[PDB]
Amino acid sequence: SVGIVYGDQYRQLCCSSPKFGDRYALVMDLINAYKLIPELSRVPPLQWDSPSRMYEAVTAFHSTEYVDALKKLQMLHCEEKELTADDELLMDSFSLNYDCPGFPSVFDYSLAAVQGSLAAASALICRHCEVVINWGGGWHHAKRSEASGFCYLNDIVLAIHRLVSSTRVLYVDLDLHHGDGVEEAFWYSPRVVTFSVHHASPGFFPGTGTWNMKLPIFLNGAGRGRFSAFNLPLEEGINDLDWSNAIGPILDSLNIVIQPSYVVVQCGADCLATDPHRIFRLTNFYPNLLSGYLYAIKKILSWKVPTLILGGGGYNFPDTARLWTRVTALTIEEVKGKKMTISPEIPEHSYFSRYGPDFELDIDYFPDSIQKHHRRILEQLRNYADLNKLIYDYDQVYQLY
Numbered sequence: 001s002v003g004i005v006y007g008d009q010y011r012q013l014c015c016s017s018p019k020f021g022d023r024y025a026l027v028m029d030l031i032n033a034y035k036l037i038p039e040l041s042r043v044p045p046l047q048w049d050s051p052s053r054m055y056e057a058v059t060a061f062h063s064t065e066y067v068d069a070l071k072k073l074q075m076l077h078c079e080e081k082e083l084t085a086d087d088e089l090l091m092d093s094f095s096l097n098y099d100c101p102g103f104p105s106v107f108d109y110s111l112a113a114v115q116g117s118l119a120a121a122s123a124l125i126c127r128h129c130e131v132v133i134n135w136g137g138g139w140h141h142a143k144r145s146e147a148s149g150f151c152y153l154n155d156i157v158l159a160i161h162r163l164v165s166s167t168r169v170l171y172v173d174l175d176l177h178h179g180d181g182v183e184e185a186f187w188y189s190p191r192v193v194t195f196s197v198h199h200a201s202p203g204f205f206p207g208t209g210t211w212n213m214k215l216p217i218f219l220n221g222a223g224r225g226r227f228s229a230f231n232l233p234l235e236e237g238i239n240d241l242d243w244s245n246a247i248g249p250i251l252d253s254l255n256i257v258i259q260p261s262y263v264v265v266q267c268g269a270d271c272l273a274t275d276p277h278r279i280f281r282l283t284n285f286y287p288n289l290l291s292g293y294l295y296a297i298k299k300i301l302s303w304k305v306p307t308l309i310l311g312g313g314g315y316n317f318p319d320t321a322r323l324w325t326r327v328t329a330l331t332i333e334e335v336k337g338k339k340m341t342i343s344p345e346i347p348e349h350s351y352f353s354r355y356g357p358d359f360e361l362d363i364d365y366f367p368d369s370i371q372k373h374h375r376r377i378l379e380q381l382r383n384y385a386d387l388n389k390l391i392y393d394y395d396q397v398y399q400l401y
């Protein structure tokens with residue numbers, strides 16, 4: 001069974017931010033327009049019975065002072081007065097500025113994603129669902145005491161913490177950007193293995209997930225977490241097939257060696273060829289019998305491990321809905337076995353006009369370094385397995401590449 005996080009108030013809050021606008025409404029309404037909702041179990045966002053319980057949940061990762069400042073930022077933006085000099089300094093000390101500004105619902109908006117992803121983790125733990133989707137979540141850049149990349153609270157870190165505290169988790173980050181906040185949270189933890197594939201290049205946000213400065217080294221975790229943070233930075237312009245071939249054997253080898261209890265996938269849509277970043281050239285194409293995204297999700301779901309699928313980046317809202325609608329239909333198909341039939345034409349619904357001018361489900365796109373990374377990653381995986389007394393066929397894994 002496949003769950004999906006939704007609710008009336010949740011939708012309103014997920015649509016209340018200045019950067020992401022009504023994206024979540026387009027996503028859920030396109031899923032609904034394609035008649036997928038009856039196949040999915042609604043997972044209600046988590047609520048608490050007191051402010052103390054909410055604070056206890058969020059400060060399992062974030063500092064109390066950061067959570068206080070974020071709540072104060074919302075309060076200050078609900079009045080018409082400007083911030084005092086001292087309040088500006090306070091907000092700047094948590095990077096609550098620039099690309100992470102305040103707005104009247106900023107705390108409720110950020111908290112909603114946490115509520116959604118925590119409920120999704122719980123649904124997996126109690127075996128209510130085999131997969132849960134949360135397209136309102138996936139905010140991988142937020143740090144313990146710092147907003148980053150329009151991520152204010154790290155719903156992913158909190159969801160993973162709930163999963164491990166119930167056990168190994170494999171986290172897979174498909175966003176265009178490095179999953180730095182999740183990687184940092186579990187830097188010292190061998191039980192949460194993180195793997196991000198992303199673009200990296202000089203000056204490109206957030207800057208990590210690649211060689212860093214003698215001669216540059218690839219960091220991969222620390223303490224008992226040594227070798228437990230994996231990264232695959234890729235040059236711009238990569239297409240569906242090359243991205244699939246780059247990530248495929250890594251994913252299979254991580255699953256073989258780690259044998260995760262849970263998989264958490266961040267599925268940010270900014271690798272699409274039609275994202276305004278214009279960096280990678282992935283699609284949402286799906287042969288009627290191939291999108292890098294759909295390739296990766298189908299492979300992960302074939303492992304039959306309880307899986308959380310989250311959203312993330314994606315600044316072309318209709319094309320993000322086009323992709324996540326196909327991910328949703330694929331999840332139903334792989335988990336249930338029930339074939340899912342999706343018309344090539346966008347169905348009439350509230351946001352139909354946003355899919356002009358051609359109103360198709362396919363996005364409007366005409367389609368050695370990696371060998372070195374594979375050897376480095378395969379070596380790190382062996383080192384990880386040696387440090388953690390795990391054993392595996394050091395030949396069947398090698399064969400995968």
Ligand SMILES: O=C(NO)c1cn(-c2cc(Cl)ccc2Oc2ccc(F)cc2)nn1
Pocket residue numbers: 099141148149150175177205268270276277312313314315
């Ligand atoms: O999605 C993200 N990470 O997961 C993410 C993306 N940025 C980001 C960083 C810089 Cl310096 C500039 C624009 C950024 O976003 C965009 C890019 C294009 C756009 F049309 C709308 C938003 N920051 N975080």
Ligand SMILES: [K+]
Pocket residue numbers: 173174175176177178179196197198
């Ligand atoms: K990524």
Ligand SMILES: [K+]
Pocket residue numbers: 186187188189190191192193194221225228229
């Ligand atoms: K780790």
Ligand SMILES: [Zn+2]
Pocket residue numbers: 175176177268270312313314
């Ligand atoms: Zn991104």
